[PDB]
Design an enzyme around this catalytic site. Structure first.
Site, PDB file in Angstrom:
ATOM      1  N   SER A  48     -15.152  12.688   0.147  1.00 34.91           N
ATOM      2  CA  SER A  48     -13.497  13.469  -0.806  1.00 34.91           C
ATOM      3  C   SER A  48     -13.921  14.372  -1.788  1.00 34.91           C
ATOM      4  CB  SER A  48     -13.118  12.352  -0.137  1.00 34.91           C
ATOM      5  OG  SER A  48     -12.506  11.050   0.365  1.00 34.91           O
ATOM      6  N   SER A  82      -7.775   9.074  -4.003  1.00 34.78           N
ATOM      7  CA  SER A  82      -8.396   9.479  -2.594  1.00 34.78           C
ATOM      8  C   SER A  82      -7.586   9.503  -0.888  1.00 34.78           C
ATOM      9  CB  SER A  82     -10.094   8.924  -2.289  1.00 34.78           C
ATOM     10  OG  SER A  82     -10.537   8.901  -4.176  1.00 34.78           O
TER      11      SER A  82
HETATM   12  O1  LIG Z   1     -10.731   8.078   7.791  1.00 36.77           O
HETATM   13  S1  LIG Z   1     -11.162   6.685   7.401  1.00 36.77           S
HETATM   14  O2  LIG Z   1     -10.998   4.718   7.729  1.00 36.77           O
HETATM   15  O3  LIG Z   1     -12.876   6.627   7.857  1.00 36.77           O
HETATM   16  C1  LIG Z   1     -12.137   6.643   5.691  1.00 36.77           C
HETATM   17  C2  LIG Z   1     -12.339   7.580   4.243  1.00 36.77           C
HETATM   18  C3  LIG Z   1     -12.332   7.651   3.328  1.00 36.77           C
HETATM   19  C4  LIG Z   1     -12.315   6.621   2.477  1.00 36.77           C
HETATM   20  C5  LIG Z   1     -13.293   6.965   1.595  1.00 36.77           C
HETATM   21  C6  LIG Z   1     -12.156   7.672   1.169  1.00 36.77           C
HETATM   22  C7  LIG Z   1     -12.998   7.415  -0.845  1.00 36.77           C
HETATM   23  C8  LIG Z   1     -13.827   6.542  -1.131  1.00 36.77           C
HETATM   24  S2  LIG Z   1     -14.099   6.698  -2.355  1.00 36.77           S
HETATM   25  O4  LIG Z   1     -12.850   7.820  -3.293  1.00 36.77           O
HETATM   26  O5  LIG Z   1     -14.210   5.542  -3.267  1.00 36.77           O
HETATM   27  O6  LIG Z   1     -15.340   7.666  -3.215  1.00 36.77           O
HETATM   28  C9  LIG Z   1     -13.913   5.511  -0.237  1.00 36.77           C
HETATM   29  C10 LIG Z   1     -13.788   5.871   1.030  1.00 36.77           C
HETATM   30  C11 LIG Z   1     -11.967   5.357   3.299  1.00 36.77           C
HETATM   31  C12 LIG Z   1     -11.478   5.368   4.822  1.00 36.77           C
END
Ligand SMILES: O=S(=O)(O)c1ccc(-c2ccc(S(=O)(=O)O)cc2)cc1
Ligand SMILES: O=S(=O)(O)c1ccc(-c2ccc(S(=O)(=O)O)cc2)cc1
Ligand SMILES: [Cl-]
Lengths: 242, 242
Positions: free
Chosen positions: A47, A95
């Site tokens: 992200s 995010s």
């Molecule tokens: O699409 S998925 O369900 O695979 C998924 C992808 C990404 C994230 C995600 C994004 C950013 C951050 S952070 O801002 O804390 O670094 C933490 C987690 C969560 C779920």
């Protein structure tokens, strides 16, 4: 130009962690890191890619302004803050992946590739799925490459309107007090090993700006706050923030 | 439109003080104050004038951008932070009057007068010295007039470029965390009675923005911190910030 300080490894070992912090002193044109090799190893941006993705969507008119509302699609997902309407500010702050996947589909492969090439962003490779390549496709970027990209953004040097760059820098705002301003973006690479947590951005002082790019091993979600905790410990050690 | 809530007067009496706080709920288009009469009483703007002054200097190219360095003129003044080089960001943060007096002199009285009329700013009068009229000249603005000016700035509807408005809103950044962002400007009217302190700006939330304009009697500089403390207690009571 670049110099290694392995003392910072103490802050990673204190938490059973391992990672790299890269600092760039803009006034001095000098950089520091605890691990020169890892500083230049390329990972999925996850992200943190929301920074170039935002710039591209804004410059192409996919997103008209930072107030435009992207309404929740009604699909209930695991992260509660995603299950609501967002604008660019809150989509960045939480995010909100589904909002940016819609951006990527609207942008399309041709425009996305040409923009990343013009940005000189990482390996400039969008191979994989148009709306998920930054999470499980072929794009890769190093911590030092993140800083090189962030410096261009700070100085309004990217190949997008100055307006687009100013809007994204507003949306990167994370923290501000009487001592410093932090503009940054978190990221969590989970789909392809090794799982890593990102934190890239810069610290604005009265007289200077310190660019930073860090990543660290992140086997689970529980340690994600260590990204913020360890970076600040390094900033405190280097006398950048009190 | 305006609802009087005199329970806020408690927050002034605790601190031996008297003044007005004005809030504007942007989503609901409703306003709140503890004293409607004082909310419409026009005072010297003091250093809150650094907001329009910045806008005019940027739109006229007197200030190239927020990074341009304006050297100290060599005269040691009573406020130690003034005795150094500044950019637009730090000149606003520390209310560096001699920097903005130089801006005003370069703007000139003719363009300053024209711009304030275009801004609908207060009584639009600049009588006195062009480089001090907001401190001891004829300009007067009320708390509700500060709100209406700030609302135009927030929406980019002032008669300057969008770029100048974005830069000034960046320079107004005062505080930011996971709960809110405050963009605001302090002011202290010292040369003409009544001596008053100002704090004007707005609070950005995820889903709303709350504009605020406050002023209070300020016979001594020892009470200047009460501007933010009293405003924040009102914001806390109204469940705007935690
Ligand atoms: O699409 S998925 O369900 O695979 C998924 C992808 C990404 C994230 C995600 C994004 C950013 C951050 S952070 O801002 O804390 O670094 C933490 C987690 C969560 C779920
Ligand atoms: O009259 S002098 O030219 O010496 C003079 C001295 C001090 C100030 C002053 C004080 C406090 C603040 S602030 O606390 O509201 O930011 C802003 C400005 C203005 C003019
Ligand atoms: Cl900002």
């Amino acid at each position: 130009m670049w110099q290694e300080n392995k003392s910072w490894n103490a802050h990673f070992t204190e938490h059973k962690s391992q990672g790299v912090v890269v600092l760039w002193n803009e006034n001095k044109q000098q950089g520091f890191t605890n691990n020169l090799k890892r500083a230049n190893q390329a990972f999925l941006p996850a992200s943190t890619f929301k920074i170039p993705n935002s710039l591209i969507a804004l410059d192409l008119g996919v997103v008209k302004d930072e107030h435009q509302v992207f309404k929740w699609d009604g699909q209930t997902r695991d992260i509660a803050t995603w299950n609501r309407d967002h604008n660019l500010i809150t989509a960045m702050k939480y995010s909100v992946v589904p909002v940016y996947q819609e951006f990527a589909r609207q942008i399309g492969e041709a425009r996305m590739s040409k923009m990343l090439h013009a940005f000189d962003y990482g390996n400039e490779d969008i191979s994989g799925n148009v709306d998920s390549f930054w999470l499980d496709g072929g794009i890769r970027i190093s911590a030092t490459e993140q800083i090189s990209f962030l410096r261009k953004l700070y100085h309004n040097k990217l190949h997008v309107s100055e307006r687009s760059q100013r809007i994204v820098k507003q949306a990167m705002l994370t923290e501000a007090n009487g001592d410093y301003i932090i503009r940054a973006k978190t990221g969590y690479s989970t789909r392809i090993e090794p799982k890593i947590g990102w934190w890239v951005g810069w610290v604005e002082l009265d007289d200077n700006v310190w660019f930073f790019a860090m990543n660290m091993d992140m086997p689970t979600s529980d340690g994600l706050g260590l990204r913020q905790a360890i970076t600040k410990e390094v900033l405190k050690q280097e006398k950048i923030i009190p």
